[PDB]
Symmetry: D2
Subunit: 346 residues, 4 copies
């Protein structure tokens, strides 16, 4: 089968021919119908040799949707042909976090050698992929696979981040979304669907601010030195109830701290090495909590899929073939994908 | 009346004779029965002239309990003689936070000129004190005033900090308490009363570790460079579900970040200027939230009082006269009060 | 001043001339700009002499909006001319419930002689009204008073009922609204604004089903013996996550029990004497909680006002003069007000 | 192997000799170390032929602890000899409830033919028992099996019931526990461990009231006509914040409604056919919710085990052999087991 793999440290990923895998006991083989590109793949491929720990080669893609092609021995709960999304952040399934579906916060996974697809195990950027267990598949019914693939991370991650503080986001609240890319453009829509928050989007790029308004942002602010003051002018001086920072650069985190309300929240979702919030007296408002959330829970993925099925999420995508996978990663690097890149095999 | 006031920047507070105040409309005059000393008073008196904004003179004391002495015009809901605790962090009463009793997070109070007693308005370190409104009094019934005065901040603040994340602190959880002083020794007891968390106390001083064990800590370990490893050995490598840092120095915040569990919590309660948690990827576990909480809510003060009345809080105090107030502040500075200092007028 | 009062047990309310009140210390005099009619007023006026406890005469109206006309001695926080809504369910202000703004659940109010306007104290169906304390006023800014008056009960009560179980109403959930009148037509809109629940409206009257669809219900079905089966067909056999019953008749409560999901919720909001849910094993699904909520909290009223100001609530009203107040009550009795009746004094 | 089975409708269970089962793929064979008797087994054996649906014969016992004896094909995560408690209310593992560990509220289990051990599948009152999946085992380490077996239902069920409303049970709250048997005597202890609620225990039997005080009840009240007044005298007239009714007879539910506070909670946990709360205006306080909870969640079982391991639960038991199993059921019927009956296979 055809796959896109990271094969050499510091090199672009390549299209390869590798064996179609066979599912062992408990496993499911999917025919991949769509595989999302996430900017985290760029972080992974930019790691120096000393830090990179996912093994080579690595079939990329941790945003996967497919149809069940083959059931491993003992698997029930799915039939051949069933359309499914892959729950990405695999946990041990047994610990207290996993018992609540919070496999994203499993502390046993590392020691047990459990790695996610596209991030230590073979990913979805291939004609076929293996899933370890039935509990990591969520049915999507007749959802368009191209728009469904991003739900598994571009949807799941903002959904989880928002869910952690949803009780704060009542009528009269304001939520700031910083970074209107793959995650952020879905984040805006989740906020509109599950809360009555007023949504202010922030981006460097005017076309991304246009995208923000297209997907339901109430206001759009240019990122940079003026952003904090502009956001404060929009919130009447009180600041924003919650800031969801999908960039996570020091400058955006600083913006977030300068605008968050007393008893509000900053969610640092975007990853920029070294960047951090400074949470201490006189540096942040009283009661304003800060967290770096990770991925999301099993039930949260189901909820994201339910939003999509109800017509609440307009996922902006551009489609690529497997052959175009490396080109798509170059596009993601340069910031020229308006929303989420999605590879559609064959 | 006799009062203890901060009167000159950089100087020790002094015992003064000033007029007994008279309550205006809506106000209540209390005869103070106990006034707690909080280390925040030390922070206030150490502010340089450029930062200090509470006015001079300032009658100290933001931990106050008393008996109703005089009702201002229009006040009902209290009779003369009623024993009451003063809710300290006065808000506007009208905004969305205040409407939920969360006057500690009122953003309108500053612009309206509303300041708390002992921190801009006259405090409880005096024979009498004024309270602005009935909603800032909580009845304490027959609670011993000496043990009650600390409830208003030493109790309230940890109670609020713990309450923010109480749903995390189920059976099998671990809570670390750093700093077993006024706040911390009450924090341990609140954790034991309202959760099934295992409680690990941390302090510099071995006598404070003994205090921690006396008030129900499951383990008590020495603060400093070895504390993170010692705490991890106790938690089996998984770390602590929540860390309540009542010191808030950079070294204790660093300890907190090195021990907090995935999806846990750090509450930076103690105040040390410039100190901060560094909340970013690779610097803290996934899902571990960090906050600097402030004071507590109206209903939280009532709950603290209810814990005290039920016998769940053994408040360790040392009692001082008004005349000894300045000496008590010196004792607080040097760290020689085992628990909370309380002035009794 | 002109007022509408209940003056004789069993008789229609009457238009009267009574003294314009003067505010004592702590009180505020409002010039009433709009006064809502609630079906609870019908329940009150239908009480026999032995049950009726609100005193005669009683100026009706517990849904009040006005402008501050006179400040009593010592009142600050409001200026003359400020547009305000009256928080209805007055409590003691001092107990643990009141300290959280939950004056609706105050247990001390009765013993202290504290009664709400229109329900023991003089109401808003008059040119002027007294409010006991500043904490019972919420600013409405430039909101149209006619559409604002219903927020104080038609908005507040459903808002509170929904808020009690808002965490259940995630994506994929279904909420049933029974009774699309004053409360119900606002309840539908609150559900759409603060949740991603699919909303199924139920009413006896086809025109009310049309109203339900106009204000955003996803489906609207006829009440009665077939309603439970029709709702189950819409929910795929799993039943409804939550049922908000704004009728509260035995037949509607029975419908609610026959459709509620496992681990769901029934909120019995409507008042029909003797009617009750039967909460016991084999009579209701496992984990399905049932409550009779009452009014709402101070912060909830502020949130309702915030929804209205954000354009999320289209309040359907019909306007009456004070002189038409008794006629409006006859209209409410016969069920011919499409939404909420509102008296506008002048 | 020896087992205790219900074999004939209306007859006492019998000691039988049946084949030792062998684990199929995914299954685990446990050597049973302790098997709890629950009064629900009495309800099951009293069902007429027309209602009884669990098949005959049925190996009783849905409170099971054991050691891993044999691993089925594919099972890892447990080693032979590991001490484990069985999570009883088996669900499908895949639905939204199950994804959160809430298999107790699974709606798919019935249609998939999934039944719990002792309640449709073979139970723990045998020398060995099969568990369907690793996710239904929770490690107990060196916990005494006799005191551990009741945790799986006598602990789990009250724990779940309490957990549903734990935020109500702050300092100053009162919780009433009605019925100080298997469940109730553990319920008291959970309340003391996880809340600062004052606990009032209610029972018919003075020896059970003594047991209540032994396990930490603050007060003990004789059940019956005087109980409501006695409880109100203890709560100062305000009533009880929460009532956990482990009897669920009409008289105890009536007591519960007569004592529950405004904005409180009644949890009807005990099963008495036909008995129900009457939740309607004028029949219950405003805001007082009522539910019939069922079993508990996966993570709740882990928490119960954690309480036991921390020394917070003193489980009162009487031990029986397998041969004495039928005698133990007679003892349970007559109400002569002080706490929980536990069979220990030889
Ligand atoms: N925490 C998690 O679990 C998690 C999960 C997935 C992705 N991520 C991270 O989230 C981030 C976003 O991922 P993506 O795939 O959406 O990226 P993307 O490249 O699709 O989007 C980036 C967006 O941010 C904007 N942007 C860049 N710098 C900005 C600034 N200084 N101010 C405002 N806007 C700015 C860009 O214009 C673009 O709209 C990445 O760092 C990724 O690794 C985190
Ligand atoms: N956030 C708020 O709303 C709020 C409210 C009140 C007080 N505070 C702050 O809480 C802090 C504690 O106040 P207090 O009155 O309890 O102080 P205290 O002087 O009574 O107690 C300090 C305790 O901390 C211990 N300690 C000091 N340095 C330590 C270290 N590095 N590691 C471990 N233990 C250490 C001491 O040995 C002592 O037991 C102060 O900074 C105070 O200003 C905050
Ligand atoms: N719990 C509380 O705090 C609270 C507060 C306010 C009002 N209420 C009560 O809520 C109820 C609704 O009040 P309102 O002012 O909205 O009434 P309304 O008369 O404006 O609306 C009643 C609606 O219910 C519909 N209806 C009547 N019987 C029905 C049935 N069997 N099935 C379906 N629909 C039916 C009518 O067609 C109408 O659309 C009243 O009983 C009132 O007393 C309760
Ligand atoms: N909801 C669930 O998921 C669930 C789970 C397990 C058990 N149960 C049910 O819980 C109930 C209790 O089970 P158990 O095994 O603890 O029973 P048990 O026989 O061990 O205890 C019954 C206790 O209730 C007391 N009692 C009986 N009638 C009473 C009355 N009128 N007032 C006060 N006390 C009274 C008895 O004296 C005894 O102390 C049973 O009905 C059982 O079926 C429910
Ligand atoms: C490398 C990065 C992957 C997150 C993601 O799934 O996008 C992470 O593990 O934090
Ligand atoms: C000066 C200090 C006071 C805190 C306290 O009330 O103890 C603060 O405002 O943070
Ligand atoms: C009299 C009635 C008033 C309800 C309402 O405010 O509509 C009640 O209190 O039940
Ligand atoms: C028969 C009974 C079993 C409850 C239990 O597990 O004890 C029920 O299904 O409710
Ligand atoms: Zn990603
Ligand atoms: Zn795990
Ligand atoms: Zn202080
Ligand atoms: Zn305020
Ligand atoms: Zn009404
Ligand atoms: Zn009250
Ligand atoms: Zn049972
Ligand atoms: Zn299920």
């Amino acid at each position: 089968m055809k796959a896109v793999q990271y094969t050499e440290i510091g090199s672009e990923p390549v299209v390869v021919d590798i064996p179609t895998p066979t599912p062992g006991p408990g496993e499911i083989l999917l025919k991949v119908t769509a595989a999302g590109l996430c900017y985290s793949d760029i972080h992974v491929m930019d790691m120096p040799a000393a830090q990179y720990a996912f093994g080579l080669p690595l079939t990329l893609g941790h945003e996967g949707v497919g149809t069940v092609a083959e059931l491993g021995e003992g698997v029930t709960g799915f039939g051949v042909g069933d359309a499914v999304a892959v729950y990405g952040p695999w946990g041990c399934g047994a610990c207290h976090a996993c018992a609540r579906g919070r496999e994203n916060y499993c502390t046993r996974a590392a020691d047990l050698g459990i790695t996610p697809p596209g991030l230590g195990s073979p990913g979805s950027m291939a004609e076929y992929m293996i899933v370890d267990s039935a509990r990591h598949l969520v049915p999507i019914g007749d959802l368009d696979p191209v728009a469904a693939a991003p739900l598994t991370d571009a949807g799941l991650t903002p959904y989880h981040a928002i869910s952690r503080v949803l009780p704060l986001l009542g009528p009269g609240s304001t939520a700031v979304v910083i970074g209107v890319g793959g995650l952020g453009h879905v984040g805006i829509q989740i906020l509109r669907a599950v809360s009555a928050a007023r949504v202010i989007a922030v981006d460097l790029d005017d076309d991304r601010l246009a995208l923000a308004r297209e997907v339901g942002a109430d206001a759009a602010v240019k990122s940079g030195a003026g952003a904090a003051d502009a956001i404060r002018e929009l919130t009447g001086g009180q600041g924003a109830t919650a800031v969801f920072d999908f960039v996570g650069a020091q400058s955006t985190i600083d913006t977030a701290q300068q605008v968050v309300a007393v008893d509000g929240h900053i969610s640092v979702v975007g990853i920029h090495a070294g960047a951090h919030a400074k949470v201490g007296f006189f540096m942040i408002p009283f009661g304003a909590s800060v967290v770096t959330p990770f991925a999301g829970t099993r039930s949260e993925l189901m909820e994201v899929v339910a939003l999509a099925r109800a017509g609440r999420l307009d996922i902006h995508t551009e489609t690529f073939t497997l052959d175009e996978g490396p080109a798509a990663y170059r596009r993601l690097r340069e910031g020229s994908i308006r929303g989420r890149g999605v590879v559609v095999p064959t």
